[PDB]
Nucleic acid binder design. Structure first.
Ligand SMILES: [Mg+2]
Ligand SMILES: [Mg+2]
Ligand SMILES: [Mg+2]
Ligand SMILES: [Mg+2]
Ligand SMILES: [Mg+2]
Ligand SMILES: [Mg+2]
Ligand SMILES: [Mg+2]
Ligand SMILES: [Mg+2]
Ligand SMILES: [Mg+2]
Ligand SMILES: [Mg+2]
Ligand SMILES: [Mg+2]
Ligand SMILES: [Mg+2]
Ligand SMILES: [Mg+2]
Ligand SMILES: [Mg+2]
Lengths: 223, 86, 180, 66, 156, 125, 186
RNA sequence: AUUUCACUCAUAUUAAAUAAAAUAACUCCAAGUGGGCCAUUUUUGGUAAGCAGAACUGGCGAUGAGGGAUGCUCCUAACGC
RNA sequence: AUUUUAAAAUUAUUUGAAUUUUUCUUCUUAUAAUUUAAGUUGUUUCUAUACAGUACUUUCUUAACCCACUCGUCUUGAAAC
């Protein structure tokens, strides 16, 4: 019938309004947290104490080596972290277990802590989705919000800013949001590397360590 | 469906607003607050100083004391070791 | 402003302690000052020295501050004295050296170059103790005394350093090195 | 004339080619040689239970048809 | 010639520890075992009857048969591309009630009461264990007098 | 070397000659796959003969078209070219080699009436 | 490069088409493929798959076993994707409604004499499009003699496999390896 | 021990984390192979050896492309047009 | 031959509220059009007022620049003295 159309057209409108409201709330949250951190330190200096900041909860990991000549335990961890070829990148939740998984493969990767605008750029410029029945997935670029809501809106995420929120802060829906995305495929950086052989913390030019907030600079060049 | 060209989701306004139903408001607010500032040049950059006198002079003593103490402790360790040498 | 004259060395102030336990619940607090390329390297050296000197490993400690001390008079000239300790091919040694500069890390950069040139000592075998400023009447080295006379003058005796554009490869008159 | 006589190079590469297989995890096993004088008694118990169950089934089939 | 006997290479594995020789205690014979229990095989060399083979020292299995003074155990063993089940028949002195399972039992008994209360007050509680994770921020108060400055040491 | 005229694209135009066919005259130029250890053509050394592969294949939409941009059908007598009256803008005819001149004249003058083109309407004249 | 297994490609492990060339069977396959697709019923999918299998996976079913399977299902329809055969060991037969790919002459006569009926699959497509009140049945698929030679080799301890022998008697493979008196048993 | 009957144990976040985990499990019929060698690390005989004999991984054999002037095994990296 | 729709954006009239107080301020709370949506469209000239010309298509021949050891076989290893 024709009435089949009007109800759907109304439901889409109400869903869009709700998404707008939630995005505004997210913006308020970002600003308020940013301003609270910036005065707690300023007050600590006055009262002769130190303010140790909360640690991170999220990393972004990039592979540095090819696929030949690797020990089996390294290959198992690469399979479990979904890094399959040279310049791929994924998000990882920070635990006591992932840290020990990560120490195994440290001389072959580089990683660190991402900001908000970096998450937004990764999601908008290089964001691809898995679409289909289970175990048949057909990588598709986003271009729209219906695919997100179809698979993942049961947990109240209908839109792209919702996934940004759940990734930049380890929200309750993080395993599903992260597992929903295809692994990122990145260009080589625009001014080259220094030396993949050596580490970031060695007194020489090198790469392979954990570089905490300097990962944003690198992934803006190899976006 | 047949696949088409993939549109740049950051520089194409129509798809950007399609994906983010709240981006138009934020961009408009930023543009308004950007124009307000330039329309008040030769009338801004003056109040900044008169309030910097208000609060930076209060912060200055605390900062100076902190760094003074750090340097003094670093000196104390040096003298204590040099005297220990003999 | 001129990225061809910069060194990548800065100074940092790091504070740490151990995680409080049931046996110890007011653990000692430690501070240091390190010269490094970025703050991540400085934290690396901080935990290295905590483990070597005290019994503190990173995995049961916690960091409290990283601050990056800046320089107050970046255009005045100072005298500096450094204390070293480095490993040679057949032993380990320690020395005292003196430099002239406008910033502490501007002197640390000179020190690394001199220790590579004169002794073939890599940065991984050098530990820096106690950079400090010294007065002009307590200077010990002859090559610093040279520069603090009453009225310092000398002629300029370098060959020219021209732009790449006016470095014409095939000239019409052979130039001069005199330049008075 | 002399040749190699032992190595196990390549052996667990072949072993892990088709994985390391596990036993099939069944529910019952055979009590053939196991504790006598305890399972003969179990046979008697189960015979009694079956006699009761089938007597009830026969009885119900007898009333339901009147 | 090659020498692959039954007890070859058991010099240090099959010998009593320091100042701890002698036969077992009287309470060893009062242990309670049932079918399906978990069990550890630890060879005791002061009793030469029912001695397990070299390989099965220090392994864990399940009971499948109980006799007058013996126990049958099901133990896994890896053979070159697969795991085979073995049936090991040992005497009662080389058998120990396994302790690998106690955290599960304490967890079940403890969580039962928590679930009973939570459903009593109509609540939504989580009972799965928690991986250790990152830490929140805190304000740590220390007087400037208690901070001590340290620097690398000169060589002696 | 890619050749393209309109919508038709050819991915290569040179033949794949047989290895060693320029040096030994008992070896014919028709392509045969090299088998046998130590070849340097089977092992893909640079600087020698290339091997054909499925990657050079043509577009499905333009796989059998002539530069005329029509498919070719070969006829032997008049009665065989009657199915062309329904599809005359997609096909062109060519006359077989072993038909006589008298038969050819009739085939040509019927193709003219049907408004279909003849590829070789100049032979035996 | 990239580290996948069977690189990026999915494996399937069975028969995909008909091998037979009977035109009537091809028409049946077409019909039940259409029914399976346009009404995903799980009843027409299974039937569409079963009439693709080879001969060894479409065994016959006897009359007595068919009557035994239908004892608690009066006025229902039994569906078999094989032949059904007679059984002299039965004394009497009830009234049954059965759809099967083939009937033998004696079985067909016995079924119709008791008031039952025999159906083909194109009639079952016309009367029970989604299989209401229909019971799917199979015959014994591991009763063939060839399956008595499979499994463990005859000679491994405690096996049940038959051997391949010229003939049978005291002179044909009964001496060493099958009794304790000649050096070991099995 | 078993057999019945009654009551009750988180689940939509899945009784710890992570997972292009069902590309799984099983049965049948068969091919080729059963002279190996090399590198970092551990290691036996020998004054030693581009010698003889073992262990765990990765390779060469069965394999081309960029670099090391040159080179079966080193570094980067594995191959449709 | 009926998902190049819907929606979104834009422009010009509107029906009402905010606030950031405005020639890009917001909220499709009413109609029309347009594309920035919904993978390239237009205008001039030449070939040319030709029928095979020295132009265009194609096949041979001969240069340049870079590169390229003799196949088959046994062998851990072949361009092999
Ligand atoms: Mg470089
Ligand atoms: Mg390496
Ligand atoms: Mg032993
Ligand atoms: Mg061709
Ligand atoms: Mg070879
Ligand atoms: Mg590929
Ligand atoms: Mg041989
Ligand atoms: Mg190779
Ligand atoms: Mg060389
Ligand atoms: Mg031979
Ligand atoms: Mg060979
Ligand atoms: Mg030889
Ligand atoms: Mg050869
Ligand atoms: Mg030679």
């Amino acid at each position: 019938a024709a009435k089949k159309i009007k109800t759907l057209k109304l439901i889409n409108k109400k869903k869009r309004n709700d998404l707008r409201q939630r995005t505004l709330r997210y913006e308020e949250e970002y600003e308020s947290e940013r301003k609270k951190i910036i005065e707690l330190k300023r007050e600590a200096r006055k009262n002769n104490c130190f303010y140790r900041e909360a640690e991170k909860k999220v990393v972004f990991v990039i592979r540095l080596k090819g696929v030949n000549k690797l020990p089996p335990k390294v290959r198992s961890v690469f399979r479990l972290l979904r890094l399959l070829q040279v310049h791929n990148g994924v998000f990882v939740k920070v635990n006591k277990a992932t840290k020990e998984m990560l120490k195994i493969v440290e001389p072959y990767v580089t990683y660190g802590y991402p900001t908000l605008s970096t998450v937004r750029k990764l999601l908008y410029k290089r964001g691809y989705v898995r679409v289909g029945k289970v175990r048949r997935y057909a990588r598709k670029k986003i271009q729209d919000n219906a695919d997100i809501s179809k698979h993942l809106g049961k947990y109240n995420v209908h839109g792209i800013e919702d996934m940004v929120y759940q990734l930049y802060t380890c929200g309750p829906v993080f395993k599903k949001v992260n597992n929903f995305l295809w692994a990122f495929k990145l260009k080589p950086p625009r001014k080259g590397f220094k030396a993949k052989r050596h580490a970031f913390n060695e007194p020489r030019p090198g790469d392979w360590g954990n570089r905490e907030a300097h990962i944003n600079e690198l992934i803006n060049r190899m976006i | 469906k047949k696949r088409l060209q993939n549109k740049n989701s950051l520089t194409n306004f129509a798809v950007r607003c399609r994906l983010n139903p709240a981006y138009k408001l934020l961009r408009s607010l930023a543009v308004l607050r950007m124009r307000k500032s330039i329309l008040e040049k030769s009338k801004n950059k003056k109040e900044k100083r008169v309030q910097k006198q208000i609060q930076k002079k209060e912060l200055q003593k605390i900062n100076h004391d902190y760094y003074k103490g750090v340097a003094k402790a670093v000196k104390k360790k040096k003298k204590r070791e040099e005297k220990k040498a003999k | 402003i001129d990225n061809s004259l910069n060194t990548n060395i800065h100074q940092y102030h790091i504070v740490g302690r151990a995680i409080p336990t049931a046996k110890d619940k007011n653990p000692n607090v430690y501070r240091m000052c390190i010269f490094a390329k970025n703050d991540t390297n400085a934290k690396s050296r901080f935990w290295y020295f905590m483990k070597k000197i005290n019994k503190l490993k990173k995995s049961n400690g916690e960091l409290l501050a990283c601050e990056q001390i800046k320089e107050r008079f970046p255009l005045r000239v100072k005298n500096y004295g450094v204390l070293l300790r480095y490993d040679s091919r057949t032993g380990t040694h320690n020395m005292y050296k003196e430099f002239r500069d406008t910033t502490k890390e501007g002197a640390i950069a000179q020190l690394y170059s001199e220790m590579a040139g004169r002794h073939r000592a890599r940065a991984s075998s050098i530990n820096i103790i106690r950079i400090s400023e010294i007065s002009s009447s307590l200077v010990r080295r002859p090559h610093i005394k040279q520069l603090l006379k009453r009225r310092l003058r000398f002629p300029a005796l370098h060959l020219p350093t021209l732009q790449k554009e006016y470095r014409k490869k095939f000239a019409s008159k052979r130039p001069s090195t005199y330049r008075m | 004339a002399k040749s190699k006589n032992h190595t196990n190079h390549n052996q667990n590469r072949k072993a892990h080619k088709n994985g390391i297989k596990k036993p099939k995890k069944h529910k019952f096993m055979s009590r053939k040689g196991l504790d006598p004088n305890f399972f003969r008694n179990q046979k008697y118990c189960l015979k009694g239970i079956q006699k009761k169950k089938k007597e009830l089934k026969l009885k119900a089939k007898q009333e339901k048809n009147n | 010639g090659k020498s692959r006997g039954k007890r070859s290479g058991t010099r240090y594995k099959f010998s009593k520890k320091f100042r701890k020789h002698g036969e077992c205690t009287a309470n060893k014979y009062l242990e309670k075992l049932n079918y399906g229990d978990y069990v550890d095989i630890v060879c005791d060399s002061t009793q030469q009857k029912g001695m397990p083979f070299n390989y099965y020292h220090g392994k864990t299995g399940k009971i499948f048969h109980i006799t007058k003074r013996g126990v049958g155990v099901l133990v896994n063993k890896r053979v070159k591309h697969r795991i085979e089940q073995k049936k090991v028949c040992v005497r009662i002195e080389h058998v120990r009630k396994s302790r690998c399972n106690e955290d599960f039992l304490l967890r079940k008994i403890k969580n039962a009461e928590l679930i009973k209360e939570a459903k009593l007050k109509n609540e939504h509680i989580n009972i799965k264990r928690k991986t250790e994770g990152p830490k929140p921020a805190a304000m740590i108060k220390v007087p400037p007098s208690k901070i001590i400055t340290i620097e690398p040491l000169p060589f002696y | 070397a890619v050749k393209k005229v309109g919508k038709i694209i050819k991915k290569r135009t040179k033949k794949f000659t047989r290895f060693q066919s320029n040096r030994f005259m008992r070896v014919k130029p028709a392509w045969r796959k090299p088998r046998g250890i130590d070849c340097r053509v089977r092992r893909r050394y640079k600087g020698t003969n290339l091997m054909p592969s499925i990657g050079y294949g043509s577009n499905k939409k333009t796989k059998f078209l002539l530069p005329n941009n029509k498919y070719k059908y070969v006829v032997k007598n008049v009665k065989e070219m009657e199915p062309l009256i329904m599809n005359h803008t997609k096909y062109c005819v060519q006359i077989a080699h072993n038909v006589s001149s008298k038969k050819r004249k009739q085939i040509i003058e019927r193709a003219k009436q049907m408004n279909v083109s003849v590829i070789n309407a100049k032979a035996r004249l | 490069g990239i580290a996948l297994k069977n690189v990026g490609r999915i494996k399937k492990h069975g028969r995909k088409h008909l091998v037979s060339k009977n035109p009537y069977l091809r028409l049946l396959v077409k019909l039940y493929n259409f029914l399976a697709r346009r009404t995903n019923a799980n009843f027409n999918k299974i039937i569409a798959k079963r009439l693709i299998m080879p001969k060894r996976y479409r065994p016959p079913l006897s009359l007595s076993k068919l009557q035994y399977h239908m004892a608690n299902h009066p006025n229902d329809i039994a569906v078999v994707v094989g032949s059904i055969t007679d059984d002299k060991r039965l004394f009497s037969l009830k009234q049954l409604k059965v759809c099967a790919l083939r009937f033998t002459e004696t079985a067909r006569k016995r079924i119709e004499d008791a008031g039952g009926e025999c159906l083909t699959f194109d009639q079952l497509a016309l009367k029970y499009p989604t299989g209401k009140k229909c019971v799917l049945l199979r015959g014994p698929t591991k009763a063939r003699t060839a399956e008595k030679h499979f499994g463990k080799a005859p000679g491994k301890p405690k096996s049940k496999a038959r051997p391949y022998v010229r003939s049978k008697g005291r002179k044909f493979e009964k001496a060493r390896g099958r009794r304790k008196s000649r050096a070991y048993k099995k």
